[PDB]
Design a protein around this nucleic acid. Sequence first.
RNA 1: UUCAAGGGCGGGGAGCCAUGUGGACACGACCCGAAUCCGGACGAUCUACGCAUGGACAAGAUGAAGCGUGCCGAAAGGCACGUGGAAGUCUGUUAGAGUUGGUGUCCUACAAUACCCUCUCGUGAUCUAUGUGUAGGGGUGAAAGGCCCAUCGAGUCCGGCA
RNA 2: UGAGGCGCCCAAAAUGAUCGGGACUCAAAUCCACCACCGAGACCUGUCCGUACCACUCAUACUGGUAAUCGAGUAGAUUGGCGCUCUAAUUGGAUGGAAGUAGGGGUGAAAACUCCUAUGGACCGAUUAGUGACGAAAAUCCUGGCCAUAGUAGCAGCGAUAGUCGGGUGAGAACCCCGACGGCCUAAUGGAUAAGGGUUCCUCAGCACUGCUGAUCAGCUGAGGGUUAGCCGGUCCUAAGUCAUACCGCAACUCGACUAUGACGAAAUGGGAAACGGGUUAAUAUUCCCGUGCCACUAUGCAGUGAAAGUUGACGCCCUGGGGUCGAUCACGCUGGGCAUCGCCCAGUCGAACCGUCCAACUCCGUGGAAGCCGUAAUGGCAGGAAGCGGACGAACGGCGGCAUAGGGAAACGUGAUUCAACCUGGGGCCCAUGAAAAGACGAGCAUAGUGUCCGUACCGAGAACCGACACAGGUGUCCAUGGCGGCGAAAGCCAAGGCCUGUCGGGAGCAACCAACGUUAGGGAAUUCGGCAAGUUAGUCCCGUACCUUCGGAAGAAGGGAUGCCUGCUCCGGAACGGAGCAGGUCGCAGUGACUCGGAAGCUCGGACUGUCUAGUAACAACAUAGGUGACCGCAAAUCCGCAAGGACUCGUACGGUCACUGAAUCCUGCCCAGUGCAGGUAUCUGAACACCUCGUACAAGAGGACGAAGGACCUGUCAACGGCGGGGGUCUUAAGGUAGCGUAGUACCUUGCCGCAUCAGUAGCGGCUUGCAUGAAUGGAUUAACCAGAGCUUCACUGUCCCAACGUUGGGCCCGGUGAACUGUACAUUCCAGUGCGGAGUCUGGAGACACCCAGGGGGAAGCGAAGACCCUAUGGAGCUUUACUGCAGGCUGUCGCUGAGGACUCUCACUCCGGGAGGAGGACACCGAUAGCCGGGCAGUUUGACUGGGGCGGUACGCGCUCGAAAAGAUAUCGAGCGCGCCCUAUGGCUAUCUCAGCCGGGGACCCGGCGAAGAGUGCAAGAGCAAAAGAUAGCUUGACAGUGUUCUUCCCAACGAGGAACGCUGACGCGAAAGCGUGGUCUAGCGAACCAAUUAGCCUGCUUGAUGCGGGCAAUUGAUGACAGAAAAGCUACCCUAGGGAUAACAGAGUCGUCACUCGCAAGAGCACAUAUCGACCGAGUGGCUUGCUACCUCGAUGUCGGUUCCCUCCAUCCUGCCCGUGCAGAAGCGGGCAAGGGUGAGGUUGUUCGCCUAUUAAAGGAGGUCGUGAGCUGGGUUUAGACCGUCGUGAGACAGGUCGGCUGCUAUCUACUGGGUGUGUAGGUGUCUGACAAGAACGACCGUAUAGUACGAGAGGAACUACGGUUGGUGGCCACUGGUGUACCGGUUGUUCGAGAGAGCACGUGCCGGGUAGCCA
Length: 237
Amino acid sequence: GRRIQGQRRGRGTSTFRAPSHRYKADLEHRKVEDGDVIAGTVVDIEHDPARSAPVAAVEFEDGDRRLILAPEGVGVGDELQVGVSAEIAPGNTLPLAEIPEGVPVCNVESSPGDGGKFARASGVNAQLLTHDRNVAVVKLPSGEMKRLDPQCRATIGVVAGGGRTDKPFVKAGNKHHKMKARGTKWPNVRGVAMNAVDHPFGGGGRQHPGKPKSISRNAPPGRKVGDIASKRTGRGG
RNA sequence: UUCAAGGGCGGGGAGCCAUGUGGACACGACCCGAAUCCGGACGAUCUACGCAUGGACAAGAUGAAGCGUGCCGAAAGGCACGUGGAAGUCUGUUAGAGUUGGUGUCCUACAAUACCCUCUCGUGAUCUAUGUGUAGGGGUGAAAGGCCCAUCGAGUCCGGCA
RNA sequence: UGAGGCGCCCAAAAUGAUCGGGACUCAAAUCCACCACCGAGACCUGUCCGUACCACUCAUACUGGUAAUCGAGUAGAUUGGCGCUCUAAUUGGAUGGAAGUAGGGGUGAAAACUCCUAUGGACCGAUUAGUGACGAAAAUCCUGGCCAUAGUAGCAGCGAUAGUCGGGUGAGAACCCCGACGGCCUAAUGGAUAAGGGUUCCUCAGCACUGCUGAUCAGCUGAGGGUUAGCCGGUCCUAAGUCAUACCGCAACUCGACUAUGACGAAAUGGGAAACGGGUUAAUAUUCCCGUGCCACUAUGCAGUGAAAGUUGACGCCCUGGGGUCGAUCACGCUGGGCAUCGCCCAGUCGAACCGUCCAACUCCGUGGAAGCCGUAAUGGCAGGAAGCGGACGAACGGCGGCAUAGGGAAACGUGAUUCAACCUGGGGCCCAUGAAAAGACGAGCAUAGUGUCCGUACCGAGAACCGACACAGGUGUCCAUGGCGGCGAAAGCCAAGGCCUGUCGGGAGCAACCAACGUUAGGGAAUUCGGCAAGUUAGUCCCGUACCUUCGGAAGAAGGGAUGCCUGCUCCGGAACGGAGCAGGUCGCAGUGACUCGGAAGCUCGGACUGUCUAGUAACAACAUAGGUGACCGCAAAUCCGCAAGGACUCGUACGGUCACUGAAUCCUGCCCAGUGCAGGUAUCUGAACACCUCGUACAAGAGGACGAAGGACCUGUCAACGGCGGGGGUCUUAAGGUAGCGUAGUACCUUGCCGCAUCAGUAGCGGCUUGCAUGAAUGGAUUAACCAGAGCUUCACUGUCCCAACGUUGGGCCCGGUGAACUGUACAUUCCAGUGCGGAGUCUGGAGACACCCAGGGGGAAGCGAAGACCCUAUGGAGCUUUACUGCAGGCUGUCGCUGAGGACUCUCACUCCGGGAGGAGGACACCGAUAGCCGGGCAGUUUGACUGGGGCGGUACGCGCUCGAAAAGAUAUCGAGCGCGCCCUAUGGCUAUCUCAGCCGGGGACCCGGCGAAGAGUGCAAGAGCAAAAGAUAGCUUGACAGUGUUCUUCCCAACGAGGAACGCUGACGCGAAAGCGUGGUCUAGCGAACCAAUUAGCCUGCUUGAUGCGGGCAAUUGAUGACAGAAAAGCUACCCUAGGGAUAACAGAGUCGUCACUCGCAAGAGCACAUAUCGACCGAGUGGCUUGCUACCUCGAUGUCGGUUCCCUCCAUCCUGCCCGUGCAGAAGCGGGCAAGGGUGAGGUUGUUCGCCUAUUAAAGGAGGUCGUGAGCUGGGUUUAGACCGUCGUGAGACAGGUCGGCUGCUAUCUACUGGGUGUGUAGGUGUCUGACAAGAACGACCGUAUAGUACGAGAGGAACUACGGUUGGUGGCCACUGGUGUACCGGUUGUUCGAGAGAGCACGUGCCGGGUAGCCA
Ligand SMILES: CSC[S@](=O)C[C@H](CO)NC(=O)/C=C/c1c(C)[nH]c(=O)[nH]c1=O
Ligand SMILES: [Cl-]
Ligand SMILES: [Cl-]
Ligand SMILES: [Cl-]
Ligand SMILES: [Cl-]
Ligand SMILES: [K+]
Ligand SMILES: [Mg+2]
Ligand SMILES: [Mg+2]
Ligand SMILES: [Mg+2]
Ligand SMILES: [Mg+2]
Ligand SMILES: [Mg+2]
Ligand SMILES: [Mg+2]
Ligand SMILES: [Mg+2]
Ligand SMILES: [Mg+2]
Ligand SMILES: [Mg+2]
Ligand SMILES: [Mg+2]
Ligand SMILES: [Mg+2]
Ligand SMILES: [Mg+2]
Ligand SMILES: [Mg+2]
Ligand SMILES: [Mg+2]
Ligand SMILES: [Mg+2]
Ligand SMILES: [Mg+2]
Ligand SMILES: [Mg+2]
Ligand SMILES: [Mg+2]
Ligand SMILES: [Mg+2]
Ligand SMILES: [Mg+2]
Ligand SMILES: [Mg+2]
Ligand SMILES: [Mg+2]
Ligand SMILES: [Mg+2]
Ligand SMILES: [Mg+2]
Ligand SMILES: [Mg+2]
Ligand SMILES: [Mg+2]
Ligand SMILES: [Mg+2]
Ligand SMILES: [Mg+2]
Ligand SMILES: [Mg+2]
Ligand SMILES: [Mg+2]
Ligand SMILES: [Mg+2]
Ligand SMILES: [Mg+2]
Ligand SMILES: [Mg+2]
Ligand SMILES: [Mg+2]
Ligand SMILES: [Mg+2]
Ligand SMILES: [Mg+2]
Ligand SMILES: [Mg+2]
Ligand SMILES: [Mg+2]
Ligand SMILES: [Mg+2]
Ligand SMILES: [Mg+2]
Ligand SMILES: [Mg+2]
Ligand SMILES: [Mg+2]
Ligand SMILES: [Mg+2]
Ligand SMILES: [Mg+2]
Ligand SMILES: [Mg+2]
Ligand SMILES: [Mg+2]
Ligand SMILES: [Mg+2]
Ligand SMILES: [Mg+2]
Ligand SMILES: [Mg+2]
Ligand SMILES: [Mg+2]
Ligand SMILES: [Mg+2]
Ligand SMILES: [Mg+2]
Ligand SMILES: [Mg+2]
Ligand code: NA
Ligand code: NA
Ligand code: NA
Ligand code: NA
Ligand code: NA
Ligand code: NA
Ligand code: NA
Ligand code: NA
Ligand code: NA
Ligand code: NA
Ligand code: NA
Ligand code: NA
Ligand code: NA
Ligand code: NA
Ligand code: NA
Ligand code: NA
Ligand code: NA
Ligand code: NA
Ligand code: NA
Ligand code: NA
Ligand code: NA
Ligand code: NA
Ligand code: NA
Ligand code: NA
Ligand code: NA
Ligand code: NA
Ligand SMILES: [Sr+2]
Ligand SMILES: [Sr+2]
Ligand SMILES: [Sr+2]
Ligand SMILES: [Sr+2]
Ligand SMILES: [Sr+2]
Ligand SMILES: [Sr+2]
Ligand SMILES: [Sr+2]
Ligand SMILES: [Sr+2]
Ligand SMILES: [Sr+2]
Ligand SMILES: [Sr+2]
Ligand SMILES: [Sr+2]
Ligand SMILES: [Sr+2]
Ligand SMILES: [Sr+2]
Ligand SMILES: [Sr+2]
Ligand SMILES: [Sr+2]
Ligand SMILES: [Sr+2]
Ligand SMILES: [Sr+2]
Ligand SMILES: [Sr+2]
Ligand SMILES: [Sr+2]
Ligand SMILES: [Sr+2]
Ligand SMILES: [Sr+2]
Ligand SMILES: [Sr+2]
Ligand SMILES: [Sr+2]
Ligand SMILES: [Sr+2]
Ligand SMILES: [Sr+2]
Ligand SMILES: [Sr+2]
Ligand SMILES: [Sr+2]
Ligand SMILES: [Sr+2]
Ligand SMILES: [Sr+2]
Ligand SMILES: [Sr+2]
Ligand SMILES: [Sr+2]
Ligand SMILES: [Sr+2]
Ligand SMILES: [Sr+2]
Ligand SMILES: [Sr+2]
Ligand SMILES: [Sr+2]
Ligand SMILES: [Sr+2]
Ligand SMILES: [Sr+2]
Ligand SMILES: [Sr+2]
Ligand SMILES: [Sr+2]
Ligand SMILES: [Sr+2]
Ligand SMILES: [Sr+2]
Ligand SMILES: [Sr+2]
Ligand SMILES: [Sr+2]
Ligand SMILES: [Sr+2]
Ligand SMILES: [Sr+2]
Ligand SMILES: [Sr+2]
Ligand SMILES: [Sr+2]
Ligand SMILES: [Sr+2]
Ligand SMILES: [Sr+2]
Ligand SMILES: [Sr+2]
Ligand SMILES: [Sr+2]
Ligand SMILES: [Sr+2]
Ligand SMILES: [Sr+2]
């Protein structure tokens, strides 16, 4: 047949790329020499096109003006700290080691100095549970217990924008505007609604997948559609 | 070949070459005739979708939240009037976009998709110009096997090829 | 009373009857005899030719001879000859005229040869041997040329109907120019431009070309000329993004991703230093010239030490205040014009950049001191300091002054105001959406001077300059969005400025038919139709008023009702408007939203929630999307995806994420099933590859086996909002469960027009209910639902030419004339008609009939008309797209192993390598990544296959390999999807021999046993059938292994007649068994029980392997076993309605033709009953027929096409008669029924469901008959059904997909040549004229039917009931004609009146061929 939509994606053509030339900044933690002698002042709160959440512009002591992944409760004028000796206050960044157990953090680094990888979406937060000399245990938004190098930096507090998901889009037009700010092809035509040549589920008088939807992990691209390697399906049992 | 026998093939000198001609096989194989398949190229001046930078939307209707005033209330609030001006909101041949019916006109046409009346949309998932990107078993597709320069259930050109 | 001959009745069909026709009756019939004739290419006969044979001969050269026993021919075989080109040898012709061509003479059976004459003006032969791009009637053959078509179609149709009278120029004027009059265009038909074009621009001179006619004209032809820039674009900047170089990949590159660098990337329309006004030319113009001004850089001078922080460039959508120019309008003045019953109407009244100055808003400061005040259109503001007062900063493309005794104007050369586009500046609101960047500029003075180069510059910008082959009704961006009236308006309509008469052929006919657009139609009012399709109705604004239902938004403009102008004088709101809302009085019309503009309304049901999307070019929908619901994967060194790789999208993203899927708003809900399939997890044991390891084997190696065992599978578990499933049976069974809530005859229900009800005169429709559901049912989502809809169906009110039933009118065509001027199509002939025949669907054949030639107009019956090598169907060892547990492979994923890879069946470490980090360093780590290989998964991808037979194909079946009987016609051979029926083995005895013996069955004596008798065979002999067999071929007993090895002959397979395996009969040789021996035994009495090559295993001996020997392991001769049943041998599944090609009437669908079982109709016989009575009437059985209306059968015609059903319109016919006329019978009193006969003149109608045909139903009727004409009628109409592509449901299928099952949508080309006919002409014939006739023939339905009255309340009859003859009056259908009457029309005409323009008035134009309304003459009509 013809390559399915999931295969057109990988080519990274315009239709599938994110509007990067419109994105603001890479909200990675600042790189400090050591000591924590780095402080800045929240100079402004801005909208972040790539995450539908707010971001804060900070002016650091040494003269660096950088956008920051802002937690909830940060406002203009407030002073933020980034370093091993930073104060344990919402909005400050420091290694997990320096963080008191039982404190919600966000923008947690995967590997020390990478800039942050976990808990960066609207209103989410990781939960630092255990400390140690070799391993800091964090509970991520998905609820999974993650073991991290205690040298991994994080920001105290939860991410700004919480509850963004509580309000329904109501209209296709609203979904539309948001989708235009992402790297996604939208709207979505059902596989069952296409011709056999276009999808494993296409074809047949009435619409229906002429096959079970749970597909093997080993399936090749073009065939791996439907419920990928499902451990189970439905709501029952 | 055969204990044995019986079979098979060959045996008392005619061939070799040349020229014409009958016929066979591979090759285009008496000549034309068709839908393919493959290779390398050329096309996004059409069109599909995305992106960049610009542009367009008379007038009218309806009257959301919010706010106000008055009365009622212990309060919560309620009611009335006003204000306000929301909306993939209504009417609209505004610009602009489209095309339900006439199965009208035309059907060697004005036109290889046109004409007229009726009809639908017209502040938005809107329409539109230019630039720009995606290329052939590949694009693009709110999916009709639609569209990729009058051609697409696999473009076009030349070649494979007689 | 029997028999025979001829005839009669039985006896009905569709355009015109037939024996070929005429026509025939003591025959021109039939039968019995006879007589004489005609009539082939036969037969006889003369001459000649060919061929064969004979004699003579070198001869196949002559000559002679023979043919009763020779003379036709498609495919094909054989052989002699004609012509063409060039070569060679030999030999000729030609300027005293070659070849060729044209006409003509001669020869040859013919191919073809030759001569004469004319033309021509230079080459041309013959013989012989060669050479070959050597011969055309044909291929929808190719190219060129040409005729008919035809002086034909077009030069009309579009909301842009456009001209006319004079004159000018010229050889020539409808369309070239001037004037007048008349018109057209207003977001365009005007002005400026982008792309694109490229000289189209201007001038002069032209008209052969181009131009829908003409042309003096031009976008055409000839010749010249024309585009002038510091300040308008380019140039500069960067955008999405592109390229180049470096680096890396790649076999490689002109290929490819990242990362660096550099460059490229915006001409209307992104950012951006600076120019305005006027004048000038045939054509340029912010470019030239005049005046005035400005910017940048540089130099000099003065000033200045500031200089980079900040600001700007620089920004979304929606609402809105304020400032404010142009425009427009109002008031008054000035200048000029127009009009002249008034006193009005029009135009103008100007003046830039720039320099200078003014500042509202915003922000902030001082003062002040609000505890309730300040403020807005609105929000709002304040002791964190309100108002008020003062102040800093601070705007216009704006005001003001200069510019300006610049410019411009004939002149005047204004002044104020309102509403205010541009432009300036604020306030508010929205985002799961956040609305560029960079160069540059400001920051940062002034004088004077110098420099400011390079490229573009014309013109069109479109119903003739662009793209569409065109001077194409198409397509094509920007701005002019503020000209006047109008009105809500950037709407309509009318009119300016400006443009045009080129959406470019004209002339003529009261101008016919017919067609395209359109106006008006009495009464009825959807009767029309599949369907109100088409048309119409309603309409603007204000007031009153407004249901069910509802998600409380809506429904809603629901519905329904009323008002509407003008004039006079006023009130209210507001600062006011040339803004708005009202009042009082007066008054006109048919009509006051007067034209124009401008909704018809209501209810029920189905679907999809909604806005949105889509098949460019037959589908706009119920399909796609959607928010909402849900499930799946993934912690980021991730999941998913692209790349061979280098690398990459997602991703400046991180679970409130984003990937993969399903369902499809809300609301109420979403049951049972984990057996199969899918996914996932687990797994003692089982199974499970390669490397390494072990055993055997090999001096080694091949190889055989073993141990170990990953993923995977077995096995267990989880999982259905995972594929899917939820039946039959009984009061469980398959295969897990056995259908719960709901809904239900459904867009799903075959039966089916289900049944009841509603509604209608009548309702296959629709709605409600019932419901056992052929075959509903829960995210394959169920139910339900307000709102929405060019979605499907139904009903009602209103309205109407849809209809009854048509008419009249308008505009453009049509017709005639001038000019211009195609195409389609053409084997030939062609004046046809009725029958027949023929490959069964004829203008051309046969027989008749008719027919004087030509032309004009017409509507289209026929030419199975033209257009397209049928899209249907089948066939082909065709193609393609699609599917899958088809065949075979390939990517990809998982997994083991080896290399990378290091040190000390579980472990530590660091040093390769990986990742994080700017770095130090951290994390990990011999793993991972990568290379190689092995096992598993693997329609994600590729190549293929998927057979044949067949009363078409499919399904079914196998007549696909074998044996028997019959078919089979007495040798042999012989078909069908012919009839009956078998074989794919079985048997160590059920084989072989020998000995002894005789069987079924019946009878007699003591179903077992014993004895006797009869008994040619009916028994038995493995299994079909047919055949064979009795001291046996059977039975019993005993013995035995011949069911043996080798090798042939022959026949069969395969008649004749070639073909393999297989088989049989008969031999020779060897070895045996039994018998006294002859002899028997090559399996079972005979005919079925079967399998190639390649390969393997096996048996015995031998041959052989690359210089040589040995060993291993191979190659071969002969043969046995292993299978191909599609059985003389491929390894092999489907869909296509998205389809494509080659062909086929070799094969189907409709139709024709044949048949006539079926169907319709009739007849013979007459049982039976009809109270008695066969026959008033009904009528079984059985028998005999006719038709060609039903159906089936066949495959004869057609696949280079003969368009389906139904309807409609229009014409002809048949009779088997429904009515009407005339009769006969009756179980006929009458009236009326019932049955029958003659008879085809006429009639046979309107409606409800349904596409229907049919049929059911309703009211009428004399009756409301049936059938043929290609199931008459699409070059006539329709397009509802059927029958393409889109989509849904039920059922089927793993799936693609399928289903005379249902459902919504879905294209109808052509200018008539011939013929035919309706009408109209011109000629010829009869044979200069006028007028009047005849009547062969021809057409008619010209008339059909009914009601009523008198007869008569009579005849008849107890009564009830109730006729006729005849004479009358009227109605209806049909027919022909006419307009006094009634009615319609009446774009003659007269009137009323709305908007607008001409100043008013008067009088007029436009508002589509009347703006609208009223009346209406002639004429035409019903
Ligand atoms: C020129 S061919 C005309 S068609 O054959 C006309 C005939 C009329 O009987 N129609 C049919 O035969 C229709 C057959 C159909 C069949 C077999 N199957 C279907 O599903 N639908 C049909 O219409
Ligand atoms: Cl989202
Ligand atoms: Cl000859
Ligand atoms: Cl320019
Ligand atoms: Cl304001
Ligand atoms: K055919
Ligand atoms: Mg970041
Ligand atoms: Mg996008
Ligand atoms: Mg979807
Ligand atoms: Mg589809
Ligand atoms: Mg597929
Ligand atoms: Mg383009
Ligand atoms: Mg209001
Ligand atoms: Mg574009
Ligand atoms: Mg010679
Ligand atoms: Mg020739
Ligand atoms: Mg003609
Ligand atoms: Mg001239
Ligand atoms: Mg000019
Ligand atoms: Mg024109
Ligand atoms: Mg009427
Ligand atoms: Mg009818
Ligand atoms: Mg209509
Ligand atoms: Mg007032
Ligand atoms: Mg229905
Ligand atoms: Mg919809
Ligand atoms: Mg279409
Ligand atoms: Mg539509
Ligand atoms: Mg969803
Ligand atoms: Mg769906
Ligand atoms: Mg849907
Ligand atoms: Mg019903
Ligand atoms: Mg369920
Ligand atoms: Mg579904
Ligand atoms: Mg064909
Ligand atoms: Mg087909
Ligand atoms: Mg194929
Ligand atoms: Mg890295
Ligand atoms: Mg395939
Ligand atoms: Mg092949
Ligand atoms: Mg076949
Ligand atoms: Mg015989
Ligand atoms: Mg084989
Ligand atoms: Mg063997
Ligand atoms: Mg065979
Ligand atoms: Mg074909
Ligand atoms: Mg034939
Ligand atoms: Mg046939
Ligand atoms: Mg035809
Ligand atoms: Mg009769
Ligand atoms: Mg009687
Ligand atoms: Mg008649
Ligand atoms: Mg017919
Ligand atoms: Mg016809
Ligand atoms: Mg037709
Ligand atoms: Mg026609
Ligand atoms: Mg229909
Ligand atoms: Mg489809
Ligand atoms: Mg069908
Ligand atoms: Na092929
Ligand atoms: Na393009
Ligand atoms: Na309100
Ligand atoms: Na339309
Ligand atoms: Na292709
Ligand atoms: Na012959
Ligand atoms: Na031709
Ligand atoms: Na000024
Ligand atoms: Na003209
Ligand atoms: Na809309
Ligand atoms: Na299961
Ligand atoms: Na079901
Ligand atoms: Na809609
Ligand atoms: Na009419
Ligand atoms: Na005709
Ligand atoms: Na195909
Ligand atoms: Na086959
Ligand atoms: Na059959
Ligand atoms: Na044999
Ligand atoms: Na018959
Ligand atoms: Na009659
Ligand atoms: Na009917
Ligand atoms: Na026909
Ligand atoms: Na018809
Ligand atoms: Na038609
Ligand atoms: Na028809
Ligand atoms: Sr990052
Ligand atoms: Sr980083
Ligand atoms: Sr499917
Ligand atoms: Sr469940
Ligand atoms: Sr483009
Ligand atoms: Sr709207
Ligand atoms: Sr239509
Ligand atoms: Sr119409
Ligand atoms: Sr057309
Ligand atoms: Sr509208
Ligand atoms: Sr195309
Ligand atoms: Sr070729
Ligand atoms: Sr002969
Ligand atoms: Sr002969
Ligand atoms: Sr030739
Ligand atoms: Sr001609
Ligand atoms: Sr005209
Ligand atoms: Sr036209
Ligand atoms: Sr001339
Ligand atoms: Sr010109
Ligand atoms: Sr550039
Ligand atoms: Sr610009
Ligand atoms: Sr204003
Ligand atoms: Sr110009
Ligand atoms: Sr222009
Ligand atoms: Sr145009
Ligand atoms: Sr004018
Ligand atoms: Sr002209
Ligand atoms: Sr009239
Ligand atoms: Sr009707
Ligand atoms: Sr009707
Ligand atoms: Sr359409
Ligand atoms: Sr729902
Ligand atoms: Sr399972
Ligand atoms: Sr039930
Ligand atoms: Sr005609
Ligand atoms: Sr058949
Ligand atoms: Sr025998
Ligand atoms: Sr199947
Ligand atoms: Sr289909
Ligand atoms: Sr034909
Ligand atoms: Sr008769
Ligand atoms: Sr009668
Ligand atoms: Sr019929
Ligand atoms: Sr019926
Ligand atoms: Sr039907
Ligand atoms: Sr169907
Ligand atoms: Sr239809
Ligand atoms: Sr004569
Ligand atoms: Sr009477
Ligand atoms: Sr009486
Ligand atoms: Sr008029
Ligand atoms: Sr009106």
